[PDB]
Amino acid sequence: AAKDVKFGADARALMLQGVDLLADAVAVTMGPKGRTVIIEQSWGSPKVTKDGVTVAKSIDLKDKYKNIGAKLIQDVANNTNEEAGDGTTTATVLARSIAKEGFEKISKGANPVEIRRGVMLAVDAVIAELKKQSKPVTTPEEIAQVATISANGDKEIGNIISDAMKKVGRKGVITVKDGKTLNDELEIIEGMKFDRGYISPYFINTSKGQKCEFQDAYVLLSEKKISSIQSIVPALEIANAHRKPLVIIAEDVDGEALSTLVLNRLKVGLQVVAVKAPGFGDNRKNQLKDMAIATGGAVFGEEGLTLNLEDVQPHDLGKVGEVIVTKDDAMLLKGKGDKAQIEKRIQEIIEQLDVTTSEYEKEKLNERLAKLSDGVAVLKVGGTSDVEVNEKKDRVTDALNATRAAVEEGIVLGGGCALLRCIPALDSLTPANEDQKIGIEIIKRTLKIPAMTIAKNAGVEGSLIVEKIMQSSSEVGYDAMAGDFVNMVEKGIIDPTKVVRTALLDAAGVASLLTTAEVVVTEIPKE
């Protein structure tokens, strides 16, 4: 596969052209006054999006050289998204500025490696300054303000997010789902729910809603399948002797056992129900064990210390205040397990969370903890059409990620003033040689880009706005939407520290490396 090689300024110019194209495409979506971007899909309706990463990841150029810069900027945006979940457009603009300055400052005697060293030094100093400047979050109003700002200045989403986290705690489980109505909703699921329905409709006893209901019902857990008639008779004997319903959670119920259950329920009125055990693999056993602790019962069929169903006892069956089972989902509301073991199980789960880190394992552990502790909340966003629902879901997810980040770390002035306030810190550095001085100057000049872009999107001269902000007091910033200088903290225009620092770090790291190239090798295009 023959290859083409270009030397010197030509390759840099072409790469800069590609970077500028992608950055210009992504920059028009920045600020409260930004505008959306339409992407043409290959199978159906186009996407109308306002996310920087989504726009960046859907641009590939014909020329083989510009595509290199496009790919590098895509990597910057994707890394920022993966690390923080927000602040991708800021990363893109910062990377573009750094790349432009680096390409402009090269000369015959310059040493790009030392320039990169100086850039990294300046970035480290700026990040330290940001960490000094931060402040924690304590009030729900701050949470609501962060959520509102991250969601394109929409107040309803912020209020919904604040209510959700208030109800299920700040570090709970929250998810976004497609709605079917015009207006969004918040639904909170409490107790134990595992999305399974009764096997046979004959167990229905409450027609309204086609649901089966009990009160103070014995709970039976069986890890393995229930096949032999001899393996159930003691349980029904106990339930009928103590005049209490019985809910049978087992891997499955065989034809003979199911026939016995249904016939007894029909002809004697004995209150009994059966549901499939939830989860697959080790998750099934884990959930069964957790239910056993929650309801104070015992599980049958464990490989270790196996217990036989033929010798069930009244103390082995857990007690639950309420049980609801329908076509699709089942709910155990009020367990009766002892508190100490519940707390110990919670402690073990949280300890396990820190042991092994994988998205699936971590998510499963968090879901189990939420089920066993406080519950989960579901956000359903509505709209007139699918395009609207998707576009709103993007913003809602951005708001959730930003709010979580603001819970983890403090908050700083929004609107790009957080970076502008760090310029003074760069005047205390002592560059070792000339190249590090060049790098420090590059970072100092680049720190102003975000606020300038936000002002530019509003249709006003950004440079004058920045000049005015720098000379004003410490807490004064520019409110793009209103178009006047206000007290940032009071008005609630705030941003998490994690997002800002991650964006700056990733952008600088990638762009500085890019600016040291001298030769570019590509493949000749095929016919």
Ligand X SMILES: Nc1ncnc2c1ncn2[C@@H]1O[C@H](COP(=O)(O)OP(=O)(O)OP(=O)(O)O)[C@@H](O)[C@H]1O
Structure tokens at 136: 């924690």
What is the contact surface with ligand X in residues (CB under 6 A)? 29-32, 34, 50-52, 86-90, 149, 153, 398, 414-416, 454, 479-481, 493, 495
Please choose which of a copy of itself, ligand X, none residue 398 contacts, taking the beta carbon within 5 to 8 angstroms, the exact cut-off set by kind: ligand X
Q: How far is CA 377 from the centre of its chain?
A: 14
Task: Quote the DSSP letter at residue 44.
Answer: S
CA neighbor of 87 nearest in space, from 58, 51, 113: 51
Whether the CB-CB separation of 289 and 299 falls below 8 Å is answered with: yes
Residue 384, marked binder: no
Kindly give, in sequence order, each residue whose CB lies less than 8 Å from that of residue 351, ignoring residues fewer than 6 positions away.
Answer: none
Residue 86, marked binder: yes
Please choose which of a copy of itself, ligand X, none residue 416 contacts, taking the beta carbon within 5 to 8 angstroms, the exact cut-off set by kind: ligand X
Q: In the range 284-343, which residues lie near a copy of itself by CB under 8 A?
A: 303-306, 326-327
Please choose which of a copy of itself, ligand X, none residue 401 contacts, taking the beta carbon within 5 to 8 angstroms, the exact cut-off set by kind: none
CA neighbor of 296 nearest in space, from 277, 266, 321: 321
Q: How far is the CB of 500 from ligand X (least distance, A)?
A: 8
Helix-helix angle 282-295:339-355, to 10 degrees: 150
Kindly give, in sequence order, each residue whose CB lies less than 8 Å from that of residue 101, ignoring residues fewer than 6 positions away.
Answer: 442, 445, 446
7 binds a copy of itself (CB under 8 A): yes
In the bound state with a copy of itself, the residue whose beta carbon lies nearer, of 77 and 164, is: 77
CA neighbor of 91 nearest in space, from 442, 462, 516, 505: 505
Binding piece for a copy of itself, criterion CB under 8 A, among 208-216, 245-253, 329-337, 470-478: 208-216
In the bound state with ligand X, the residue whose beta carbon lies nearer, of 281 and 459, is: 459
- Alpha carbon of 509 to those of 73, 235, 438: distances in Å? 12, 66, 16
Please choose which of a copy of itself, ligand X, none residue 207 contacts, taking the beta carbon within 5 to 8 angstroms, the exact cut-off set by kind: a copy of itself
Please choose which of ligand X, a copy of itself, none residue 415 contacts, taking the beta carbon within 5 to 8 angstroms, the exact cut-off set by kind: ligand X
In the bound state with a copy of itself, the residue whose beta carbon lies nearer, of 129 and 391, is: 391
132 binds a copy of itself (CB under 8 A): no
Contacts with a copy of itself, 393-432, as mask; x by CB under 8 A: ----------------------------------------
Q: Helix (H, G, I), strand (E, B), or coil: what is residue 320?
A: strand
* The 3-state secondary structure of 185-253, one letter per residue: EEEEECCEECCCCECCHHHCCECCCCEEEEEEEEEEEECCCECCHHHCHHHHHHHHHHCCCEEEEECCE
510 binds a copy of itself (CB under 8 A): yes
Handedness of CA 363, 364, 368, 371 (dihedral sign): positive
CA neighbor of 49 nearest in space, from 397, 380, 384: 397
Among 228, 230, 472, 516, binds a copy of itself (CB under 8 A): 516
**Alpha carbons 149 and 139: distance in angstroms, whole number:** 16
Among 5, 138, 339, 471, binds a copy of itself (CB under 8 A): 5
Please choose which of a copy of itself, ligand X, none residue 196 contacts, taking the beta carbon within 5 to 8 angstroms, the exact cut-off set by kind: none
Please choose which of a copy of itself, ligand X, none residue 493 contacts, taking the beta carbon within 5 to 8 angstroms, the exact cut-off set by kind: ligand X
158 binds a copy of itself (CB under 8 A): no
Kindly give, in sequence order, each residue whose CB lies less than 8 Å from that of residue 63, ignoring residues fewer than 6 positions away.
Answer: 14, 18
Residue 50, marked binder: yes
55 binds a copy of itself (CB under 8 A): yes
9 binds a copy of itself (CB under 8 A): no
Kindly give, in sequence order, each residue whose CB lies less than 8 Å from that of residue 108, ignoring residues fewer than 6 positions away.
Answer: none
Please choose which of a copy of itself, ligand X, none residue 522 contacts, taking the beta carbon within 5 to 8 angstroms, the exact cut-off set by kind: a copy of itself
- Partners of 425 in the beta sheet? none
Please choose which of ligand X, a copy of itself, none residue 31 contacts, taking the beta carbon within 5 to 8 angstroms, the exact cut-off set by kind: ligand X
Q: How far is the CB of 207 from a copy of itself (least distance, A)?
A: 6
User: How many residues bind a copy of itself, per CB under 8 A?
Assistant: 91
Q: In the range 448-477, which residues lie near a copy of itself by CB under 8 A?
A: 459
In the bound state with ligand X, the residue whose beta carbon lies nearer, of 86 and 142, is: 86
Residue 522, marked binder: no
Phi and psi at 208, nearest 5°, equal -60, 110
Q: How far is CA 322 from the centre of its chain?
A: 33
Residue 415, marked binder: yes
Residues contributing to the annotated binding site: 50, 86-90, 415, 495
